[PDB]
Amino acid sequence: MNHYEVLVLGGGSGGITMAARMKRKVGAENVAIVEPSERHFYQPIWTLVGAGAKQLSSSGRPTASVIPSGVEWIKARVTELNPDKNCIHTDDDEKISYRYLIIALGIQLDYEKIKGLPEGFAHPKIGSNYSVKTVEKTWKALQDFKEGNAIFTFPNTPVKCAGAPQKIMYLSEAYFRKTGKRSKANIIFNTSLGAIFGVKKYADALQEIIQERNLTVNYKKNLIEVRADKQEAVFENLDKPGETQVISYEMLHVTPPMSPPDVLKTSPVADAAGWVDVDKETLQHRRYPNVFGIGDCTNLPTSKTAAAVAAQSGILDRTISVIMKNQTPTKKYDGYTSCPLVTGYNRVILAEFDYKAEPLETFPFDQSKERLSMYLMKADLMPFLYWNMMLRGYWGGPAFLRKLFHL
């Protein structure tokens, strides 16, 4: 059986980052990454790609070019995890054993749980910044928008980047004003949630924008169907089960329902919900001590962002090194996460918070204000630091910056 000291499932943000970190700790030849996609994506830039401000192609690199050099790339899907036997199966009918397992499988997109998707995306006027196949369709829908409803959704599931479904709404609103068709757009956010954002400071700041820019937010409204040929969307009222609503759109941005990766859903490593069942402070698996999880696939109760991945990777690096010495991990994850809320083509509200859902801002100024500096940071600095620093394992979140800024 193929064997690696450190086996990393998923070659995404978390998996590459931990592979680079683990390469430095155990040597590259003892690390393998299981990843089926030929292409690795800096997904946060898809917000700006859907708004026409960045190019799709710049958002991706070949997976081979982000594999830490010398680490083995197993180009395959994990199809089963047998942690009791310290091994996994791949869809190449190979079994791979490990001494340590890092699970970074991300979150799965379930567009097909909406009736009418993904077939509907073959039609104009509908996009989704969440898929490489559909984010440019967001932008085309935004360009071709003449008049009517512009509808942005948020599903009844966990989600990666809970801000992205409204980032594209603010961007669309700014685009309508830039091109003089704001008058002709009724902009609706139908979210499954009961609040616009889960942290009070930034929720209030977004509320001001919603009022100030005549945005409509319908809470507890969940998209369940797209009739893309008729340019109609069906939303269910989660507060009144059985009640639905058919609304016409001139533009629809769909945030798909998301779920644990199918292979994790039924796995012993998952909790009952399907997420990788890890210690919420050390990211060590609760039942399999040589198993670790990072990022969207875990049950860490914080927002599912790449920023959380970065902070998590610093913690998990310490956790695994301590576990290898057969010691007890002492460095705790605080739930650090960040949501750079793009509120226009040149403004970001930089939401940063922790497990308590209270602000944990990096910079000495008030990040609840729409800032140019934070837009530039999100649009131009963060991709660079992602490719050249985070993926090389040299970025563990901005906590040191926060502590250095508080002198």
Binding residues for FAD: 13-14, 35, 43, 78, 296, 304-307
**Contact flag: residue 274 with its own copies (CB under 8 A):** yes
Q: Annotated active-site positions, please?
A: 161, 339
| Residue pair 47/168 in contact by the 8 Å Cβ criterion | yes
**Contact flag: residue 315 with ligand FAD (CB under 6 A):** no
Of 275, 320, 345, residue with least CA distance to 108: 275
248 residue type, one letter: S
Provide the annotated binding site.
13-14, 35, 43, 78, 296, 304-307
Q: Which of 161, 205, 258, 291 binds ligand [S] (CB under 6 A)?
A: 161
284-303 binders of its own copies (CB under 8 A)? 286-287, 300-302
* φ, ψ of residue 339 in degrees (nearest 5): -135, 100
Instruction: Give the H or E element holding residue 143.
Output: helix 135-144
Which is nearer to its own copies, 130 or 176 (by Cβ)? 130
Binding window for ligand FAD (CB under 6 A); candidates: 12-20, 213-221, 237-245, 281-289: 12-20
| Residue pair 382/397 in contact by the 8 Å Cβ criterion | no
* Cα 160 to Cα 275: distance, rounded to the nearest angstrom: 13
> What 3-state DSSP class applies to 86?
coil
**Contact flag: residue 341 with ligand UQ1 (CB under 6 A):** no
Q: How many residues are given for the chain?
A: 407
Please, which residues bridge with residue 391 across strands? Answer: none
215-244 binders of ligand UQ1 (CB under 6 A)? 216-219
Q: Which of 339, 349, 374, 390 binds ligand [S] (CB under 6 A)?
A: 339
- The C-alpha angle with vertex 362 and arms to 357 and 365, in degrees rounded to 5, equals 105
* Cα 375 to Cα 390: distance, rounded to the nearest angstrom: 19
**Contact flag: residue 278 with ligand FAD (CB under 6 A):** no
**Contact flag: residue 296 with ligand FAD (CB under 6 A):** yes
Which is nearer to its own copies, 110 or 136 (by Cβ)? 110
- The residue with tokens 């997109």 is 109
Which is nearer to ligand FAD, 41 or 219 (by Cβ)? 41
Residues lying near ligand UQ1 in the complex (CB under 6 A) are found at 44, 210-211, 216-219, 306-307, 310, 314, 338, 340, 350, 362, 382, 385-386, 390, 394-401
Residues lying near ligand [S] in the complex (CB under 6 A) are found at 161, 163-164, 305, 339
